Chains A and B, each alone.
Chain A
Amino acid sequence: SDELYRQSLEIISRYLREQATGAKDTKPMGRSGATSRKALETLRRVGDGVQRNHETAFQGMLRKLDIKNEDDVKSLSRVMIHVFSDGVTNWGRIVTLISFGAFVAKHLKTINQESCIEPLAESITDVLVRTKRDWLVKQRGWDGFVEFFH
């Protein structure tokens, strides 16, 4: 009965497989599909720019994380939850976190570990909602995300 988690997972997972496989996801949207569709469109704009801007830095971070299986994804979750609980919250950090998740998801596809992509999207979501829930509901959730970036 967690709508915020459900909607957030739907958005973040679709973005991660899209970036990994290079093909859009035509699977029909869920309950608030209008907002989710536009948030996914927003992510394509701001998430691709973040990944391009920080390609060398994202690669250096991924190389130090050494992600090859699901247990390495778990060690990433530890890092994500620590920095997303440091008391600093803004939309730019949320975009950056999902953008790096898409970067990692591209790497998992390259090393034939596509089965680790869904666990990755779930862990980013769990970190997002657990640490930023009260802020997110104040910003009107993914409606605020869409309005903030256009």
Chain B
Amino acid sequence: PPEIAWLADAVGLKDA
């Protein structure tokens, strides 16, 4: 999801 993309991008999960 957009609201946590900043966190999920760092982890590598692309579809947040």
Chain B residues bordering chain A, tally (CB within 8 A):
12
Q: How far is the CB of B16 from chain A (nearest CB, A)?
A: 5
Q: Are B11 and A64 in touch, CB under 8 angstroms? A: yes
- Total A-B residue contacts, Cβ distance less than 8 Å: 34
Residue of A54, A65, A93 touching B6 (CB-CB under 8 A): A93
Beta-carbon nearest neighbor of B6 in chain A: A83
Category for how many chain A residues contact B: 10 to 19
Q: Are B7 and A64 in touch, CB under 8 angstroms? A: no
Residue of B4, B6, B10, B12 touching A57 (CB-CB under 8 A): B4
Q: Are B11 and A79 in touch, CB under 8 angstroms? A: yes
A82 interface residue per 8 A CB criterion: yes
Q: Are A96 and B4 in touch, CB under 8 angstroms? A: yes
Write the A62-103 contact mask toward B (1 if CB under 8 angstroms, else 0).
001100000000000001001100101000110011001000
Q: Are A88 and B6 in touch, CB under 8 angstroms? A: yes
List B residues at the A interface (Cβ < 8 Å).
1, 3-4, 6-8, 10-13, 15-16
